[PDB]
Design a binder for this molecule. Structure first.
Ligand code: TTP
Ligand code: TTP
Lengths: 198, 197
């Protein structure tokens, strides 16, 4: 019996590249706040952990900070996935799945995570599968081109994200495609693909 | 309802400094293998994670490797704390508690863990308290002097541990004392103190 088993309503995950518009999309559900559990914009936690900007440290020094940063991302997603609610619908920006299948995998490929750091994260993910219930009924994939994602990141202008290259976004895009369209990863709930290029 | 709740027998944790003799002590229960769940020498996992020696990397480059290493320690302890068994007694070398109250705290104090790494580990520990059941009925504290612990480490001669100073062992000793004798940490099951000198 997994933690949070049987405590969760129908759950929708909003996924897509950085700057694909997940938060914007989720904001359209604001008026229904009282009948839907809405968990949006988790990046605000990652930018301020008792005053420490983990997001910033990760971009400035990935070889030292990518592992604790992804570890913290995993934790916050788990807290969101398992948060109690009386509401009959839950919608979340991101999930433990994109952290694992897109970001951790890309950080392994680009050398930010050494093999031993990657293995530690993967062993944690395997333990989480066995011990924590993660309700996932539908994924909405906000599909964009990396060039469009790049412009949205620029417009928003998070200081932490000011050095993020288009190449990084191309890499992440292919990983989201692998996972959400080509089903290359053992994640099999339903996926609705939306054209988020507008 | 926490994961592993109601699946665990009476559980004993063996604690003490590096080289205090926890494994040696636990080895005396070998003949009762069939009536006791014995989980010993977890360091063997930390020295070989699909071929990677995390213990070694941590000692050689703590500022980069202390966080993933402590994260992996936490995970292996959790897997041991929650492992299923039909046996009526479980005895474990170490626990998630010593990882947290002695090693992580000492790594914070000596600068191996930056504040943000320490905060990440602590936030994980707080989530684990809320979500995972950790059976702990008795702790046996193998109390030693740091000089005696130092001798045993040198005798065993793990290559990873060849640069470990006596000062480090003095620091860890005080943390084990704080936790297991002076009750400075919010951990309150029963403690039996043994003279392991
Ligand atoms: C999920 C995740 C995000 N990040 C980073 C990428 C981003 O810089 C930041 C947040 O990314 P996103 O999770 O993509 O959030 P966002 O609000 O930027 O998305 P949108 O514009 O579509 O609303 O966190 C990681 O480094 N690792 C991860 O595991
Ligand atoms: C538990 C723990 C150990 N370590 C290190 C310390 C040691 O080098 C190594 C193992 O130490 P111990 O966990 O004390 O195991 P041991 O086998 O050395 O103990 P004994 O001789 O009493 O049987 O791992 C950490 O760095 N962090 C931790 O959280």
């Amino acid at each position: 019996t997994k933690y949070a088993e049987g405590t969760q309503p129908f759950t929708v995950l909003i996924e897509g590249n950085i700057g694909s518009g997940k938060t914007t999309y989720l904001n359209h559900f604001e008026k229904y706040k009282n009948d839907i559990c809405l968990l949006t914009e988790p990046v605000e936690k990652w930018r301020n952990v008792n005053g420490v900007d983990l997001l910033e440290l990760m971009y400035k020094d990935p070889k030292k900070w990518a592992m604790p940063f992804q570890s913290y991302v995993t934790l916050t997603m788990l807290q969101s996935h398992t948060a109690p609610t009386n509401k009959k619908l839950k919608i979340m920006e991101r999930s433990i799945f994109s952290a694992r299948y897109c970001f951790v995998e890309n950080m392994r490929r680009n050398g930010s995570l050494e093999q031993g750091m990657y293995n530690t994260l993967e062993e944690w993910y395997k333990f989480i599968e066995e011990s924590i219930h993660v309700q996932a009924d539908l994924i909405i994939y906000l599909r964009t081109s990396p060039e469009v994602a790049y412009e949205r990141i620029r417009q928003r202008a998070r200081s932490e994200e000011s050095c993020v290259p288009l190449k990084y976004l191309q890499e992440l895009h292919e990983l989201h495609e692998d996972w959400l369209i080509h089903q290359r990863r053992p994640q099999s709930c339903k996926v609705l693909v939306l054209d988020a290029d507008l």
